[PDB]
């Protein structure tokens, strides 16, 4: 369970990288 | 990018929330004994 | 345009979501290989005989480690500085026992990060920017080189290079203190001035700019909305911030020039960390911290301890205990 | 039932004197004239059923025999302990200063 | 000299206390120095046979000049403090010594490093100046403003 | 239950006192001195040059009060075990089974 | 008693995950205009 | 420092680790922000030395936030786009780091340490072949304590005979 | 505490005669010992054979006795194993082997006496540190 | 005539010398002459480990393993007395040499088996009436297998036999008994058995080569667990000499 | 390994409760009239 937990949190973080980068709110000049 | 014309807003009214929470909580009250076994 | 021309145009295109570029051409596969090998090893690699004495150390999650204790374990002392790729092993099982993953990971990573630096130059060039962000990046990079490549070269083995793990990092630090008295080394001290100072000036700058933000918002909204991306006007009053800081100390201790100030902000931690890297890189050839052991002596000749001698006692504990089955002769000469 | 054989041996004469059958060779530096020549001979020709048997080492000079006789009181013999005599540990037992 | 059979002496880890094999089989010195088996030197090579360190040569052929040389080199290892206290970092003051190898290697690593940095600096700058934006971005001709957004 | 007060003696019948663990130390050596603080026995790390082992010094432990009252132990393992416990002060019997206790000190409500 | 050791997390997630789904839906409904 | 390693295993403490992240992250932000500003400067003068091309009273940004944003977006994947947020963040990271480290030291005041992982110790006690960098470092700590305590804590009058000092082979 | 004439009074020979060294002799002794000997004997131990140290008790149980000036001067001319059985000039610095241990070439009788005096006096100052090794640092 | 620079890094250094296929002669034994083995070499080619069945009444087999400690396995430069016995048999008494190697092999599924591959104190004899060593000569004998770790070896929690803690210091108030086997280190010393089958003989140089099979226990981690049974197979070379 | 049995539910709630807090706030922000 420990190992599963550690790897799961890591995996969520990597997925979060993906969304933060490719699905960020686009910067818009004013 | 052209916006997608198929999008639709989603709703859950308060009564549905109360019903849903009742369903979940009562299901949990029922199945928890079997989860602990 | 021909296929190769098109390809070059794509590689060096300024419109890719992530810039590729020619450095990127090397960076992407090497970083991918280092990353993949690192993740698989950290989860599932068997115990590794780091010190070449048939005493395998467990680094992976599946073999009894948590996030804090786990590591990819440095290659065997038996290997020393020999090149140990997968095809040098008789089998993947041998490869794993001897710490092959470590070498694959740190070589692919050192190459990939070097190319990361180059790529920072490259994109600065494509965008019409000035070129020296990559020079700032050279400081952490040099440090990585120091602990993964240079120190092993100097000591004659990748088994003394820093472990890829949290507790392994602490292991590296403590043995380093035992063997070099790094704390008493002025380059490490400049490194500490570098990161303590970097932290200090980070907080200072942040607080000064935040303190002089021009009112553009109501109290029910975040002041951040008072800045709009790409507005030409500065978002804070630097004269007010300078008035403040200049009065906090005295006027001529404060920067009125923003360029001068931001240059300071870049130079202090970068130079400090350059010296940290050089400190590791030169203790790599055993030019060590100051040794004032038994430096104060009374009229008869009795030793009068200083704080340096207490440090020396701690270092001795580290020395005599580290790698407890690896030494057969009285001097630890590497 | 489990015993540390070295601790146990410390409760025998081995813990009181130089054991001709087990003790590491550096111990012969304790007394005048034993190290290194006699010490090497003694460890070499071990084990011994009794202390005085050390006198029967072939090739011993009369001086050597006298020195040994003078130091019998500081010697003992006990059963050979495998743990103390394997690994060439009688010549180097991993201890320096 | 004390009578040890150094070829058969098993150390605490199970590897030879004095002598062991390299990963390709050559006979080499044991202990931590197993890392250094690629070393070659005039005082050691007479003991080297086709399979590495030769046990018969070790038993019968070691000369006093070799003992001397090994003792000298062992007691002048390139380890020492910045104020030139010779030896390991825990050693007491007494011997004024830092190896010339240490001085030369450290000095030239430092210089080579700052020279790499200088190369990055002046290369980046030479590119920027040749292209003509080494002094900064032209406000009225800011290149990114003519590029399509990333998203 | 209290096991009773452990009194340690050497072969010469001198009373020896176990040096107590200070709070700073997660682990602590086992050293026994006479009433003047002169070292008389210990549990050695390296054995090869031991001078003070319980075996060599003939250390015994006799208990007074508590459950072991009036009893005396002379076998080195037992004596050593009790010396080990004596670094924590008075010696007690514990039920470690009921709670699956792991043998590692925890703080009290004062601490928390 | 000797209960199943995953019973606790199982019950907690059984409650929390769909409850939270519902709460998200409800709140974003309230926050819509009109 | 060394006392805290040997006696408290302070490096193992997650509050100290958060401290380290805040200080090293603060240093990183200092460096990267200063360098980014200096390398997205507008040409506001004719000098090749560009410091003089600034006026404290000027109304314009002296560097390009838009270029900076595209650069870091394409290099690192993400970038600041808001200056106010940027500088608040620069306040937040090192300040928070130091506060966390403080909490940890408050724990060490009571020897309320993050010294051990109990599961580690149960396994290692039962299994003499189980070794991790965590157990390695405790051996180092035990060395530090035994070898430094008698001179570092003279009021205790420690006399640790040679035979009880923890030492590995040879050293 | 001071470096007194009494501290500097050491056995000249085996027959109970002493010699009182001057402070200049003590300093010369430390200098020369550092010059020709400390590379192996720093702090009174012996790096290339830690079993033998320079403690006075150890030197007294040596053969011939080495816990006096004459014994140490002789040792520096014609060193032997601990039992006196082998002459080891070929692997140990000495006047006899000044040809292969060149730092011994410029050492005078006076120098040998000073080194000897250093070896005898220093344990009187440092106690167990002398010959103690790292344990006593 | 290869030099060290010819051989270094090739793996040849871990290999015993071979004899040409022509070496099928006889090496005469003069019963009035004393003899020596100037060099005995043993190059292991396979390490088999006896699986440990669950019913304890099944026929346990020796299964193959993967060597993971590389070309560090051979015994070499071994020498000793070669006695001519009353009944015409020869007995080799091992005196010294590089006569042990720590070896770790891995079983299918990942279990690692360290052993001290050795012929320490080998005493091995032929059949009676060996007037010449031939391709029919064989040696059979026994040797000692000391603990794989020697007495100073410290486990990861710093416990050892001739040095180290004598308890689990990280568990200050745990009950001792359950931990006794781990806390009290023991030094094993067992017997192994070996056969040498001579396959080639140069009767002119007195060189012999052949195959060997040895059997011995593996590492018991200073008494913490049971050893495994190991069968080692490989080739050997010996040079016989009048002494 | 003899880990703490509450560690799993502890980690799970430690992640889920505040994460869910943030997701709720975000979603009801998106649904507000643009
Ligand atoms: C906020 C701002 C940030 C500040 C961060 C601080 C970072 C820098 C800190 C530097 C502190 C320097 C303190 C000097 C202490 C001193 O008194 O130092 C004393 C030493 C000499 O020490 C003596 O060294 C002796 C050596 O003994 C040996 O040698 C003796 C004879 O020489 C005997 O033979 C003896 O037996 C033998 O053991 C003994 O130990 C003496 O007791 C001992 O006092 O000076 C020497 O070593 C001289 C050579 C080394 C000098 C190096 C100085 C620092 C170099 C890098 C600085 C930055 C570079 C930037 C460039 C751009
Ligand atoms: C705080 C104050 C400092 C503030 C910052 C200022 C920036 C520069 C700082 C420099 C230090 C100022 C004082 C220097 C005094 C000094 O050094 O005094 C020291 C000596 C003179 O002192 C003599 O120093 C000697 C040094 O030992 C040398 O000589 C011995 C005896 O012959 C031995 O041979 C030994 O092996 C050998 O190293 C001995 O100790 C003598 O007893 C002693 O009198 O000056 C020398 O050597 C000359 C040194 C020349 C430059 C060094 C070249 C090599 C540098 C390598 C860099 C690599 C990385 C370094 C990391 C740091
Ligand atoms: C960007 C692409 C790239 C690069 C540069 C590397 C580099 C490396 N790999 Mg990796 N690898 C990659 C992609 C890459 N890899 C991919 C996609 C995979 C999956 C298929 C792998 C799978 C892999 C494995 C399994 C292993 C490696 C290993 C290695 C290391 C040894 C390689 C070697 O011996 O080649 C030598 C080849 C040459 C020298 C030929 C090139 C000669 C050119 C044409 C001219 C000379 C160039 C000169 C020397 C330097 C250039 C100067 C410059 C200024 C232009 C080296 C760090 C090994 C390792 O890490 O060992 C520890 C290892 O075991 N790689
Ligand atoms: C290749 C360069 C080099 C090397 C390897 C040596 C090595 C040595 N010198 Mg020599 N020497 C040198 C250049 C060098 N020197 C120079 C340039 C001078 C004129 C100053 C001298 C004049 C000199 C004298 C008078 C003496 C020596 C002595 C020695 C010996 C003792 C050194 C010592 O204690 O240093 C002490 C260590 C320091 C002072 C530390 C220096 C750290 C520097 C300042 C850091 C610089 C970093 C970087 C360059 C800064 C860039 C800034 C960044 C922001 C970009 C040692 C063998 C001594 C000796 O034994 O002679 C027989 C001696 O008496 N040297
Ligand atoms: C990667 C390496 C690394 C990093 C980045 C850190 C970072 C930190 N360590 Mg850690 N440390 C490390 C490794 C590291 N450590 C290791 C391996 C150990 C061994 C276990 C330690 C042991 C350790 C201990 C024992 C302590 C730290 C503490 C800290 C924090 C100190 C913050 C500070 O600036 O205090 C500096 C002091 C202040 C900011 C107080 C105010 C200072 C005033 C304003 C100064 C005014 C001066 C005045 C003007 C006069 C100057 C005159 C001049 C002549 C001197 C910081 C988070 C400290 C901590 O956690 O505190 C809560 C602490 O006590 N560390
Ligand atoms: C793999 C991981 C998967 C995790 C995600 C799981 C999420 C699943 C969420 C399911 C919850 C559904 C709740 C809907 C709750 C809900 O929205 O109800 C009200 C809803 C009314 O729908 P309307 O069409 O009126 O639309 C109104 C909208 O606001 C609803 O979106 O009716 C239904 O949804 C049909 C089924 C109702 C069933 C309700 C019965 C409850 C009765 C009480 C039972 C307990 C008492 C028993 C006593 C003995
Ligand atoms: C000339 C001395 C150079 C010393 C080493 C390099 C220092 C500067 C490198 C920091 C890189 C930061 C990342 C990019 C930051 C960046 O982009 O920089 C930009 C900044 C301004 O650039 P400009 O284009 O206006 O001027 C540089 C050239 O184009 C010539 O005008 O560069 C400088 O100020 C040059 C400073 C030269 C003088 C610096 C001396 C400072 C150090 C003195 C030694 C202290 C040692 C203390 C030890 C105790
Ligand atoms: C070639 C590609 C190389 C890079 C690939 C991977 C890069 C991943 C970068 C981080 C993505 C996640 C960002 C989430 C958050 C996110 O999307 O932020 C986006 C944010 C955008 O800021 P703005 O100025 O646009 O925000 C303005 C307003 O929205 C404020 O309310 O950027 C920052 O705030 C910078 C400071 C945080 C930087 C945090 C970096 C942390 C690095 C990772 C550390 C944890 C690693 C754990 C290892 C197990
Ligand atoms: C310097 C000139 C020097 C002196 C003086 C010196 C003295 C010395 C003595 C008195 C002994 C005997 C110690 C005893 O009986 O307890 C002794 C022994 C050894 N030494 Fe020495 N020594 C001097 C120089 C050196 C140097 C430079 C070395 C290292 C190369 C060295 C080493 C040794 C060794 C080894 C021994 C033990 C010899 C043996 O008995 O087999 N010495 N020294
Ligand atoms: C998030 C992605 C998830 C995919 C990754 C899955 C990794 C596999 C984890 C397996 C769990 C480990 O299971 C381990 O097995 C042995 C044998 O039963 C147990 O031993 C009892 C251990 O206590 C247990 O921790
Ligand atoms: C661990 C358990 C986790 C469970 C996770 C469950 C996640 C559920 C996701 C809910 C997604 C809601 O999706 C959200 O819908 C609303 C409408 O309802 C959209 O809102 C859109 O329409 C409404 C119309 O009323 C407009 O006012 C709003 O301006 C517009 O953006 C949001 O743009 C969208 O983000
Ligand atoms: C050979 C040992 C016999 C003496 C018993 C050990 C000292 S006392 C012993 O210590 C345990 C904690 O370790 C307690 O749990 C137990 O209650 C107590 O009997
Ligand atoms: C996607 C690849 C994941 C990595 C595969 C892990 C190695 S494979 C793994 O090895 C263990 C030890 O040999 C075996 O016990 C186990 O049965 C086997 O599945
Ligand atoms: O491997 Mn890691 O650590 Ca650098 O010293 Mn030597 O070797 Mn080992 O001992 Mn100390
Ligand atoms: Ca239990
Ligand atoms: Ca045959
Ligand atoms: Cl270690
Ligand atoms: Cl070693
Ligand atoms: Fe700024």
């Amino acid at each position: 369970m420990e190992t599963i937990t550690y790897v799961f949190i890591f995996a969520c973080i990597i997925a979060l990288f993906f969304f933060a980068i490719f699905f960020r709110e686009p910067p818009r000049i004013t | 990018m052209e916006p997608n014309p198929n999008r639709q807003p989603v709703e859950l009214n308060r009564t549905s929330l109360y019903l849903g929470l009742l369903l979940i909580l009562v299901l949990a009250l029922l199945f928890s004994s079997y989860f602990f076994n | 345009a021909n296929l190769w021309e098109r390809f070059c145009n794509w590689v060096t295109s300024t419109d890719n979501r992530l810039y590729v570029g020619w450095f990127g051409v090397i960076m992407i596969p090497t970083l991918l290989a280092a990353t993949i090998c690192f993740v698989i090893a950290f989860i599932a690699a068997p115990p590794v005989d780091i010190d070449g004495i048939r005493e395998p150390v467990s680094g992976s999650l599946l073999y009894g480690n948590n996030i804090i204790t786990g590591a990819v374990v440095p290659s065997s002392n038996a290997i020393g500085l020999h090149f140990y790729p997968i095809w040098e092993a008789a089998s993947l099982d041998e490869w794993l026992y001897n710490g092959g993953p470590y070498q694959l990971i740190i070589f692919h990573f050192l190459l990939g990060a070097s190319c990361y630096m180059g790529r920072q130059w490259e994109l600065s060039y494509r965008l019409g920017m000035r070129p020296w962000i990559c020079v700032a990046y050279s400081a952490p990079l040099a440090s990585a080189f120091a602990v993964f490549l240079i120190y092993p070269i100097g000591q004659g083995s990748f088994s003394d290079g820093m472990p890829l793990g949290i507790s392994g990092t602490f292991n590296f630090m403590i043995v380093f203190q035992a063997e070099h008295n790094i704390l008493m080394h002025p380059f490490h001290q400049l490194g500490v001035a570098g990161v303590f100072g970097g932290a200090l000036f980070c907080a200072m700058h942040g607080s000064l700019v935040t303190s002089s933000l021009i009112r553009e918002t109501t109290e029910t909204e975040s002041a951040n909305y008072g800045y709009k991306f790409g507005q030409e006007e500065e978002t804070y009053n630097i004269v007010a911030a300078h008035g403040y800081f200049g009065r906090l100390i005295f006027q001529y201790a404060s920067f009125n020039n923003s360029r001068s100030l931001h240059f300071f902000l870049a130079a202090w931690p970068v130079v400090g960390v350059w010296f940290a890297a050089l400190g590791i890189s030169t203790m790599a050839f055993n030019l060590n911290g100051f040794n004032f052991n038994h430096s104060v002596i009374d009229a008869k000749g009795n030793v009068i301890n200083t704080w340096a001698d207490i440090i020396n006692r701690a270092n001795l504990g580290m020395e005599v205990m580290h790698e407890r089955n690896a030494h057969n002769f009285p001097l630890d000469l590497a | 039932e489990l015993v540390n054989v070295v601790d146990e041996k410390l409760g025998t004469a081995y813990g009181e004197k130089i054991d001709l059958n087990n003790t590491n060779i550096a111990a012969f530096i304790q007394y005048r004239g034993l190290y290194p020549t006699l010490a090497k001979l003694i460890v070499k020709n071990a084990p011994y059923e009794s202390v005085e048997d050390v006198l029967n080492i072939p090739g011993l000079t009369e001086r050597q025999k006298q020195i040994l006789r003078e130091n019998l009181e500081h010697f003992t013999v006990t059963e050979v302990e495998t743990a103390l005599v394997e690994g060439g540990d009688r010549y180097n037992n991993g201890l320096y200063k | 000299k004390l009578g040890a059979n150094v070829g058969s002496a098993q150390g605490p880890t199970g590897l030879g206390k004095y002598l062991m094999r390299s990963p390709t089989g050559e006979i080499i010195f044991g202990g931590e120095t197993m890392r250094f088996w690629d070393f070659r030197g005039p005082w050691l090579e007479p003991l080297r046979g086709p399979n590495g360190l030769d046990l018969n040569k070790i038993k019968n052929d070691i000369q006093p000049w070799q003992e001397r040389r090994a003792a000298e080199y062992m007691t002048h290892a390139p380890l020492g403090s910045l104020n030139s206290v010779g030896g390991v970092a825990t050693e007491i003051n007494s011997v004024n010594f830092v190896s010339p190898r240490s001085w030369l290697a450290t000095s030239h690593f430092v210089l080579a490093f700052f020279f790499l940095v200088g190369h990055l600096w002046h290369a980046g700058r030479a590119r920027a100046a040749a292209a003509g934006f080494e002094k900064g971005i032209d406000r009225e001709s800011e290149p990114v403003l003519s590029m399509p957004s990333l998203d | 239950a209290w096991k009773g007060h452990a009194v340690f003696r050497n072969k010469e019948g001198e009373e020896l006192f176990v040096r107590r663990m200070p709070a700073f130390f997660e682990s602590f050596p086992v050293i026994l001195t006479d009433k003047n603080g002169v070292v008389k026995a210990d549990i050695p790390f390296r054995r090869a040059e031991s001078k003070y082992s319980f075996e060599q010094q003939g250390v015994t432990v006799s208990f007074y009060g508590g459950e072991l009252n009036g009893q005396t132990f002379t076998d080195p393992p037992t004596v050593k075990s009790y010396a080990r416990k004596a670094i924590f002060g008075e010696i007690f019997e514990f039920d470690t089974e009921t709670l699956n206790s792991d043998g590692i000190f925890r703080t009290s409500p004062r601490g928390w | 008693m000797e209960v199943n050791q995953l019973g606790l997390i199982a019950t907690a997630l059984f409650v929390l995950v769909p409850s939270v789904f519902l709460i998200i839906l409800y709140v974003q409904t309230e926050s819509q205009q009109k | 420092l060394l006392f805290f390693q040997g006696f408290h295993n302070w490096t193992l403490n997650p509050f100290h680790m958060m401290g380290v992240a805040g200080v090293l992250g603060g240093a990183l932000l200092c460096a990267i922000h200063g360098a980014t500003v200096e390398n997205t400067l507008f040409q506001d003068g004719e000098g090749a030395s560009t410091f003089r091309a600034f006026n404290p009273t000027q109304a314009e940004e002296t560097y390009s936030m838009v270029t900076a944003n595209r650069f870091w977006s394409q290099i690192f994947g993400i970038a600041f786009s808001n200056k106010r947020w940027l500088h608040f963040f620069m306040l937040f990271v090192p300040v928070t780091g130091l506060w966390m480290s403080a909490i940890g030291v408050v724990g060490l005041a009571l020897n309320l340490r993050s010294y051990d992982f109990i599961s580690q110790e149960i396994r290692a006690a039962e299994d003499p072949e189980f070794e991790t960098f965590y157990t390695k470092n405790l051996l180092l700590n035990e060395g530090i304590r035994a070898w430094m305590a008698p001179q570092d804590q003279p009021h205790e009058n420690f006399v640790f005979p040679e035979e009880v000092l923890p030492r590995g082979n040879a050293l | 505490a001071e470096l007194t004439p009494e501290v500097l009074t050491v056995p000249l020979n085996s027959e109970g005669k002493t010699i009182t060294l001057t402070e200049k002799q003590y300093l010369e002794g430390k200098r020369l010992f550092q010059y020709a000997c400390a590379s192996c004997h720093v702090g009174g131990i012996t790096k290339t054979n830690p079993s033998l140290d320079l403690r006075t008790e150890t030197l007294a149980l040596a053969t011939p006795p080495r816990d006096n000036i004459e014994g140490l001067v002789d040792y520096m001319k014609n060193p032997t194993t601990y039992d006196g059985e082998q002459e080891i000039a070929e692997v140990h610095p000495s006047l006899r082997s000044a040809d292969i241990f060149p730092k011994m070439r410029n050492l005078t009788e006076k120098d040998l006496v000073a080194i000897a005096g250093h070896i005898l006096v220093e344990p009187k100052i440092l106690g167990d540190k002398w010959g103690g090794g790292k344990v006593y640092y | 005539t290869l030099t060290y620079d010819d051989i270094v890094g090739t793996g040849l250094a871990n290999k015993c010398p071979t004899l040409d296929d022509t070496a099928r002669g006889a090496y005469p034994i003069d019963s009035s002459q004393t003899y020596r083995i100037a060099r005995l070499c043993l190059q292991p080619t396979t390490f088999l480990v006896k699986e440990e069945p669950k019913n304890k009444r099944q026929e346990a087999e020796f299964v193959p393993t993967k060597l993971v400690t590389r070309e560090t396995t051979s015994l070499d430069q071994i020498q000793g007395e070669l006695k001519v016995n009353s009944d015409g048999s020869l007995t080799f008494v091992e005196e010294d040499g590089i006569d042990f190697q720590p070896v770790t092999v891995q079983m299918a599924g990942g279990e690692r088996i360290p052993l001290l591959f050795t012929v320490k104190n080998l005493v091995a004899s032929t059949q009676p009436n060996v007037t010449s060593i031939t391709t029919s000569t064989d040696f059979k004998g026994e040797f000692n297998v000391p603990s794989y770790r020697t007495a100073n070896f410290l486990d990861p929690k710093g416990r050892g036999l001739a040095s180290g803690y004598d308890s689990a210091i990280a568990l200050p108030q745990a009950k001792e008994e359950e931990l006794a086997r781990a806390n009290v280190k023991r030094f094993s010393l067992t017997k192994g058995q070996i056969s040498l089958n001579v396959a080639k003989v140069d009767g002119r140089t007195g060189e012999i080569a052949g195959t060997f099979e040895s059997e011995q226990l593996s590492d018991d981690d200073m008494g913490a667990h049971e050893p495994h049974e190991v069968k080692i197979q490989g080739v050997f070379y010996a040079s016989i000499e009048p002494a």
Side-chain angles (χ1 to χ4, degrees), chain E residues 135 139 142, chain H residues 46 64:
Chain E
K135 302 180 176 181
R139 287 179 183 272
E142 177 172 6
Chain H
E46 300 308 317
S64 175

PDB file of all heavy atoms in Angstrom, chain E residues 135 139 142, chain H residues 46 64:
ATOM      1  N   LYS E 135      22.450  45.035 -27.159  1.00  0.00           N
ATOM      2  CA  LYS E 135      22.170  46.150 -26.249  1.00  0.00           C
ATOM      3  C   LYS E 135      20.738  46.140 -25.721  1.00  0.00           C
ATOM      4  O   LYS E 135      20.376  46.975 -24.891  1.00  0.00           O
ATOM      5  CB  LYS E 135      22.457  47.485 -26.932  1.00  0.00           C
ATOM      6  CG  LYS E 135      23.885  47.603 -27.422  1.00  0.00           C
ATOM      7  CD  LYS E 135      24.149  48.932 -28.106  1.00  0.00           C
ATOM      8  CE  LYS E 135      25.627  49.028 -28.483  1.00  0.00           C
ATOM      9  NZ  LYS E 135      25.974  50.310 -29.146  1.00  0.00           N
ATOM     10  N   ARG E 139      12.100  48.375 -28.808  1.00  0.00           N
ATOM     11  CA  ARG E 139      10.704  48.522 -28.391  1.00  0.00           C
ATOM     12  C   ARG E 139       9.709  48.553 -29.559  1.00  0.00           C
ATOM     13  O   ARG E 139       8.651  47.920 -29.503  1.00  0.00           O
ATOM     14  CB  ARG E 139      10.534  49.792 -27.554  1.00  0.00           C
ATOM     15  CG  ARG E 139      11.126  49.707 -26.152  1.00  0.00           C
ATOM     16  CD  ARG E 139      10.922  51.018 -25.421  1.00  0.00           C
ATOM     17  NE  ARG E 139      11.517  51.023 -24.092  1.00  0.00           N
ATOM     18  CZ  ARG E 139      10.900  50.616 -22.986  1.00  0.00           C
ATOM     19  NH1 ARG E 139       9.652  50.143 -23.037  1.00  0.00           N
ATOM     20  NH2 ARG E 139      11.543  50.669 -21.823  1.00  0.00           N
ATOM     21  N   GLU E 142       9.863  44.697 -31.436  1.00  0.00           N
ATOM     22  CA  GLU E 142      10.010  43.557 -30.532  1.00  0.00           C
ATOM     23  C   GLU E 142       9.569  42.274 -31.226  1.00  0.00           C
ATOM     24  O   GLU E 142       8.387  42.085 -31.480  1.00  0.00           O
ATOM     25  CB  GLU E 142       9.199  43.778 -29.250  1.00  0.00           C
ATOM     26  CG  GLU E 142       9.233  42.608 -28.274  1.00  0.00           C
ATOM     27  CD  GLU E 142       8.586  42.940 -26.939  1.00  0.00           C
ATOM     28  OE1 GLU E 142       8.014  44.045 -26.811  1.00  0.00           O
ATOM     29  OE2 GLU E 142       8.650  42.093 -26.016  1.00  0.00           O
TER      30      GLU E 142
ATOM     31  N   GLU H  46      22.303  53.905 -26.252  1.00  0.00           N
ATOM     32  CA  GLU H  46      23.236  53.483 -27.300  1.00  0.00           C
ATOM     33  C   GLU H  46      24.452  52.743 -26.723  1.00  0.00           C
ATOM     34  O   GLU H  46      25.234  52.141 -27.466  1.00  0.00           O
ATOM     35  CB  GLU H  46      23.699  54.691 -28.137  1.00  0.00           C
ATOM     36  CG  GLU H  46      22.575  55.460 -28.848  1.00  0.00           C
ATOM     37  CD  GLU H  46      21.659  54.560 -29.674  1.00  0.00           C
ATOM     38  OE1 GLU H  46      22.175  53.660 -30.376  1.00  0.00           O
ATOM     39  OE2 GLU H  46      20.420  54.750 -29.612  1.00  0.00           O
ATOM     40  N   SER H  64      11.207  43.391 -21.128  1.00  0.00           N
ATOM     41  CA  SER H  64       9.993  42.887 -21.753  1.00  0.00           C
ATOM     42  C   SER H  64       9.419  41.681 -21.034  1.00  0.00           C
ATOM     43  O   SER H  64       9.983  40.589 -21.074  1.00  0.00           O
ATOM     44  CB  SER H  64      10.247  42.521 -23.205  1.00  0.00           C
ATOM     45  OG  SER H  64       9.083  41.924 -23.745  1.00  0.00           O
TER      46      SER H  64
END
